[PDB]
Amino acid sequence: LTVSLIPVSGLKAGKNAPSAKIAKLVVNSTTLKEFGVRGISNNVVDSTGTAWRVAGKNTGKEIGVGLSSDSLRRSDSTEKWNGVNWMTFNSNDTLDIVLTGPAQNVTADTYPITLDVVGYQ
């Protein structure tokens, strides 16, 4: 697998739209047909690791991030690996990372976003 995580440009502090895009996740593979993806943080807010909280570097304030509603609906399956839920998607595909839930008022800051991606056959 080859993965890219690309930030969305033009993001502004203040009230953002519901499900405002913030990053794109690209996953490609010449061998594997599918991939699982989970968010990585100290505060994962749902059972599949597809919604989680990220803290700002300079302010320490939290935003809610996760896979978009539309991205979630493209899932092939949910698997269980060592007990942990992993939603799977077709390789050679892009997914949207968004601000989750209702409109968020976002403080101006840098916010690190980390994901685990795994190949599946």
């Binding site: 993001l11 502004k12 976003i113 991606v117």
Partner: peptide
């Protein structure tokens, strides 16, 4: 396929 696993990270910037 655990040997194809990877952690990927980026900074997202909200400007004033």
């Amino acid at each position: 396929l655990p040997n194809s696993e990877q952690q990927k990270s980026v900074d997202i910037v909200f400007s004033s």
